[PDB]
Swiss-Prot record:
This is CRISPR-associated endonuclease Cas12a. The active site is at K783, D831, A916, R1120, D1157. Residues 1157-1201 are annotated as: RuvC-III. It holds the Pfam family RuvC_1. Part of a type V-A CRISPR-Cas system. Residues 586-594, 767-770, 874-891, 962-964 bind DNA. The gene is cas12a. It comes from Acidaminococcus sp. (strain BV3L6). The record marks T160, K541 as: Binds PAM on target DNA. It catalyses: Endonucleolytic cleavage to 5'-phosphodinucleotide and 5'-phosphooligonucleotide end-products; RNA = a 5'-hydroxy-ribonucleotide + n nucleoside-2',3'-cyclophosphates. Its EC number is 3.1.21.1, 4.6.1.22. The record marks K594 as: Binds sequence-specific recognition of both target and non-target strand bases in PAM. Residues 706-807 are annotated as: WED-III (OBD-III). Its cofactor is Mg(2+). CRISPR (clustered regularly interspaced short palindromic repeat), is an adaptive immune system that provides protection against mobile genetic elements (viruses, transposable elements and conjugative plasmids). CRISPR clusters contain sequences complementary to antecedent mobile elements and target invading nucleic acids. CRISPR clusters are transcribed and processed into CRISPR RNA (crRNA).
Amino acid sequence: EGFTNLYQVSKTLRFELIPQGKTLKHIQEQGFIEEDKARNDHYKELKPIIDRIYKTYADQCLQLVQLDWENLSAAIDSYRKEKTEETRNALIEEQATYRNAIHDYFIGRTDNLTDAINKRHAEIYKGLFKAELFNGKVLKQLGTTEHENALLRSFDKFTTYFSGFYENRKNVFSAEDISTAIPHRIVQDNFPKFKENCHIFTRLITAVPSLREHFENVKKAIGIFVSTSIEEVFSFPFYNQLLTQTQIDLYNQLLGGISREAGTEKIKGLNEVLNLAIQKNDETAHIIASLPHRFIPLFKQILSDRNTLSFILEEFKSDEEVIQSFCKYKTLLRNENVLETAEALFNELNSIDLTHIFISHKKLETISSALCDHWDTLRNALYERRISELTGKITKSAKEKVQRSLKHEDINLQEIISAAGKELSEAFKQKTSEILSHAHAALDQPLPTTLKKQEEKEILKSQLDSLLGLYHLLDWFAVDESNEVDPEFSARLTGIKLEMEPSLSFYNKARNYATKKPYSVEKFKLNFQMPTLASGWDVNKEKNNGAILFVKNGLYYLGIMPKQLSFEPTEKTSEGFDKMYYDYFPDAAKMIPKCSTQLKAVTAHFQTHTTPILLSNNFIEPLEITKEIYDLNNPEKEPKKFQTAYAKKTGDQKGYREALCKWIDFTRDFLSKYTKTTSIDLSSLRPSSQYKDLGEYYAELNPLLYHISFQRIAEKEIMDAVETGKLYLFQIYNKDFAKGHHGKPNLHTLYWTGLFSPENLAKTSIKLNGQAELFYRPKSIIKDRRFTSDKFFFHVPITLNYQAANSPSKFNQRVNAYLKEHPETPIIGIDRGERNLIYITVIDSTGKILEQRSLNTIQQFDYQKKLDNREKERVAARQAWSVVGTIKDLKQGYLSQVIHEIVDLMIHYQAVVVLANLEKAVYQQFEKMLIDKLNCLVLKDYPAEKVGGVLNPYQLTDQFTSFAKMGTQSGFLFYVPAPYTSKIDPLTGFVDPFVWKTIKNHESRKHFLEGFDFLHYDVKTGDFILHFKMNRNLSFQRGLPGFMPAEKNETQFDAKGTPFIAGKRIYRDLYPANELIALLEEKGIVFRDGSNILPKLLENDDSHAIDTMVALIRSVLQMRNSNAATGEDYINSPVRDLNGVCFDSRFQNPEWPMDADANGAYHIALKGQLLLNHLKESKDLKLQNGISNQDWLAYIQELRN
RNA sequence: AAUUUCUACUCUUGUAGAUGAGAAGUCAUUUAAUAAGGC
DNA sequence: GCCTTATTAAATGACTTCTCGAAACATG
DNA sequence: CATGTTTC
């Protein structure tokens, strides 16, 4: 062990602040809260405005850019046709090049546009990241109603709020590859999708040129990109035209299509036309089907609202809006009172001549399902009557023409009536009278009040439901005037349909307002009328930040001193609080140059002068600088000399060590001479010449700059200051701090007390950070109480392992050279089984199982059933227009305890944990929180200074930088591929070698049976043996030969005495053996002599008997047999091991997996043994990349045979 | 049925575990409605 | 009844970037 | 000059 203090972790603590004495009253009198929330409100108001600034500028820039994307296209193509570290790097660096080109356009050093406009853009940018935005001078250049500027100097003199915001906006414009940057989105996101789209287009054309023309006029029909050929919109320079959002939109529409007001025919986009073409199911459609069919739409451009040429409804504001406008609509519809004339039309149609009543072909199938048994029944009742009416000889060709004649033509009413009989008629009449009655019902019943509560919403949903149902019913009949219709009928039928369309609009608007989220009050930011509030903690500018701390006998206190004086310390244990004293020097990388080399005066003198310059201000011993140092940190070159990138370009380390050596010497000069840090005793630091890379030096320098001292003040003084109003005191408090709580505390409270413990204050494994904020949340054995009062919340960050390195240096290789050193440690592994969501496993290094568990239920609570009920209730809520609700809190309380004992008997077994890398939200969440808990591990009982305590944590996982860059192995957690863990009998280490999609027709089934050597009956044992050599049936197989070259249905009993049938297989569950005990007696084949049965069935060549035999071999070869109703998930093995045992998980032997999922987890963990046993097998190295199925599959067997 | 907050609890005016916050952005998915089709 | 492709709205969920600062500077 | 702002 000893894995601790490897890399720092930063966490955030939350507390409640309780005002003391007049403090709370003071806030009321000052009304800080109203101004604070008011400023928050104004911030939400102000954001989209300033965002219009950023957006407009980015738009101008991106309009200007035209690049040649071919080099990038090659960099991708050259990535994989064949890909290695070389092609990967080369592509990363050309990605870099294109990114940096766009960013060049942004900052105005690009070579492309003229230098005057370049200067314009640069000036604009430099203005774009600071309070300059609010002055409005920056807005002046770009091409501001009286409201916005009022908000603008509402935040004037306060702008440092938006300080945070500034960074985010820089994150949009950065040239670094970061998902949130525009250049990234253009280079790495959109352009590859574009290029692939060009590919799809080109392949499709070289296969099907007709399609090209279709594409052209599809583009003609959508009206997009009229000036440009279809072949050009798939050229790369067009992707130059694709950088603005408006263009991205238009593109994605030419793929997607335009949809205007509901009920009207939709305009088809390319993807649609392709899909329809495929569903035409001819030779062509077969071809397209073989090719890629679906163009990829581009991602949204950062920061900018999407646009559409399609239709969007007018929003519904509130209750009175929806109900008043709806009620007006319905009372209008009853004022027309031709809901009566709909019934009049249905009686009319059962009276009038029926052949003139026509039904749309599109609606016919829905008709058949509604009024009749199934859709099939009406459509092919029509079919066989139309066939019966065919003349003379009948060709299948004719029957085909029948089918497409039904799909392309409307039907008279007595055609369907006479085809399906009169059972359909009064089915019709019955549904008719129903849909009308319901409609009439909803027209009478009034509308409620407001919609505030659900049942109130329910009558609305129902009424709209039945109105809309009448609309559908009316929508059944043939629209076109081409069809022959009794003029009165069709005339006022289209009349009442026109009457019923606003019900469609009302339905959708109503759904959209109703299903909106309900209002909730939550926390807002308290800065107490200073913009720098709780920026950072230390001494000089506490006066500026107004925030200090206090401790009394274990009580914590946040003091906050809004501005318009000082505090006097005394000896300890005289009636008073101990106040923290903080002195801190933020990271000297940023800072030392700021306070020494980068001063405006230093620069200004140095462009003029060579002669060095001493500076006397905030320096005990005057500190001088020389051209060598100043230009050392400002080369007028891209790389800094002492950082390694310079070392790669310059390839000469001698000079580089000289550079970083004298730079470090300068840092120590400064420190020894700087007012704050001259007092700090640096003796611990190694000789300056020694350090290999500068970053380490900076990390070892930086902790000695953080000191937490403490001094007791007296409580009469600041009782007076509190009751004055000069100082606002809150108790930092939580549940563990109240009273009459002693059970063990929460982990964050241990972080806190331990943070301020005397031993940590001695020297620090944990540190207090700035950036803390204050919060006010208004209200909404009594629960939710904490939300029914107005309360103050305190957010402070802390850091763990301060002394430790910023990022783990080479964590995983050594992290198990620890596993290199003891193969003894067992292996935990995990599968997410569908039957039971989490399943664990623990296997001995020798390969013998220890424990098998399910976590469906923990702490005598089933979380699987609670979840199951919860998501059922969810979808019920969404189809009912009920508030959906959040499952995340439940999910992670469950997974909270799961994490708890997972790491607990990870510890007690001192083992490596192994997970599965690819329903699945629960899994991915699971190992997220697991990785997080193993980045920092603390045990509540342990003493602080002992490893595992609040001062010394365990870290078993490489730092989580992100999920995408995760290698298979992180720290002790090892990722492994899922496949074949699930489906493999453990004893056998055997599978179905083949996909069953290649055994399709009768010839291939015959060949498949001719690949097997023999099939005969064993008289002694009573079961059948089928021998197969893995070198046969190579055309059917999945290409996994593995290692080996080549059940009587009984009533067995488990360890508990429960009966089950041997060899039973499973929706549908049935035994394959007893038919072959029938099938062979149906064909009269003699199997009881041990005779080979296969040549008799193949020489007999019965089609049905051979298909049934292949289906039997199918069912035997399926090991996982599961039916949810029975609760059966089991593994039964088709082959017998060398010990003469057919494994069945229904025997319930604990030495072996109890259910399919248990076997799943079991080989998952065992594969980890295979991996760390491979690098046990090869001396030294670094963990293996991936497992191939072929390498895994072989393995078990030698081990197992 | 009490919480910085979550989940689970109640011999205990509380109990066991968990808990990286804030800001910004993006993507995915569900449901409904609609359009053209497939079965 | 189910499904494909697409558009619209409402919803939840999940991922990815940055900050976690005292002191220099400037504005009036 | 004091303090919000911008810095490296």
